[PDB]
Write an enzyme that holds these catalytic residues in place. Structure first.
Site, short mmCIF file in Angstrom:
data_model
loop_
_atom_site.label_atom_id
_atom_site.label_comp_id
_atom_site.label_asym_id
_atom_site.label_seq_id
_atom_site.Cartn_x
_atom_site.Cartn_y
_atom_site.Cartn_z
N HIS A 46 12.75 6.85 -5.29
CA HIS A 46 11.43 6.25 -5.41
C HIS A 46 11.31 5.26 -6.57
CE1 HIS A 46 10.22 9.60 -8.31
NE2 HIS A 46 9.32 8.59 -8.75
N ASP A 84 15.28 12.49 -2.55
CA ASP A 84 14.85 11.48 -3.55
C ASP A 84 15.99 11.17 -4.55
OD1 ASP A 84 13.41 9.67 -5.03
OD2 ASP A 84 12.14 11.18 -5.95
N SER A 116 10.67 9.78 -14.23
CA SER A 116 11.34 9.78 -12.90
C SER A 116 12.74 9.17 -12.89
CB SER A 116 10.51 8.98 -11.87
OG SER A 116 9.36 9.79 -11.61
N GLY A 117 13.58 9.78 -12.15
CA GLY A 117 14.93 9.31 -12.04
C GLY A 117 15.86 9.92 -13.10
N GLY A 161 7.26 8.01 -15.50
CA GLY A 161 8.10 7.21 -16.36
C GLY A 161 9.35 7.99 -16.72
#
Ligand code: CA
Length: 223
Positions: free
Chosen positions: A40, A84, A177-178, A175
């Site tokens: 995402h 994801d 994320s990942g 922020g």
């Protein structure tokens, strides 16, 4: 990261910042040419920033490398956030050192109650906005599948797990994320999603990387 601490410069040498004129997501360095992040987070125009601590000042030990290829898992569903996961190939190999280092992929999945380290430059407030300059860290356990499904009924697939604190106050947030969820020196999770941040009975939800190891290795061997 809400409720966390200042990691310390370059103490999380596999952490990367994904940048498009601002930091927008994290990721983890898994070898000299490849980063794993969340699907995402996919954008065009990504610059990978390695060796960062303060994302707003050039301090030393930074390497800025363009992404060459950005490989979203083919079965990523953006409505559910199932699968994801994204690989990003660097244009050039990073120079690995004590400050810039890869994180190992898991051989086995982690079990409930395993303590992990989650890190990021995301929002530090549950209610409102405040972005840090320097990298933040949080030690959180893996929850049971039971408590994870009881928190988010019908929304948790085999490719996810919950980590954190049901009392609230300590989580990952926008922020983050990942970025990495590292447990006993292995990358077990990717910061994916949750309901708000650090809210009671709504822990963070993570991509369960152990389900993807074959996919990661087959994709990289062909790209
Ligand atoms: Ca910097």
């Amino acid at each position: 990261i809400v409720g966390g601490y200042t990691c310390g410069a370059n103490t999380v040498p596999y952490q990367v910042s994904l940048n498009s004129g601002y930091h927008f997501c994290g990721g983890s360095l898994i070898n000299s040419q490849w980063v794993v992040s969340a699907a995402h987070c996919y954008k065009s125009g990504i610059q990978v920033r390695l060796g960062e601590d303060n994302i707003n000042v050039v301090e030393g030990n930074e390497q800025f490398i363009s992404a060459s290829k950005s490989i979203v898992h083919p079965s990523y569903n953006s409505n559910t956030l199932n699968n994801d996961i994204m690989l990003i190939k660097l244009k050039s190999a990073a120079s690995l050192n004590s400050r810039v280092a890869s994180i190992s992929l898991p051989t086995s999945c982690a079990s409930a109650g395993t303590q992990c380290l989650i890190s990021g430059w995301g929002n530090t407030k549950s209610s409102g906005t405040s972005y840090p300059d320097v990298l933040k860290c949080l030690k959180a356990p893996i929850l049971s599948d039971s408590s994870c499904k009881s928190a988010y009924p019908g929304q948790i697939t085999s490719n996810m797990f919950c980590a954190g604190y049901l009392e609230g106050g300590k989580d990952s947030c926008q922020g983050d994320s990942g970025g990495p969820v590292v447990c006993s020196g292995k990358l077990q999770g990717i910061v994916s999603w949750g309901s708000g941040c650090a809210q009671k009975n709504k822990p963070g939800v993570y991509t369960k990387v152990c389900n993807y190891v074959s996919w990661i290795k087959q994709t990289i061997a062909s790209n």
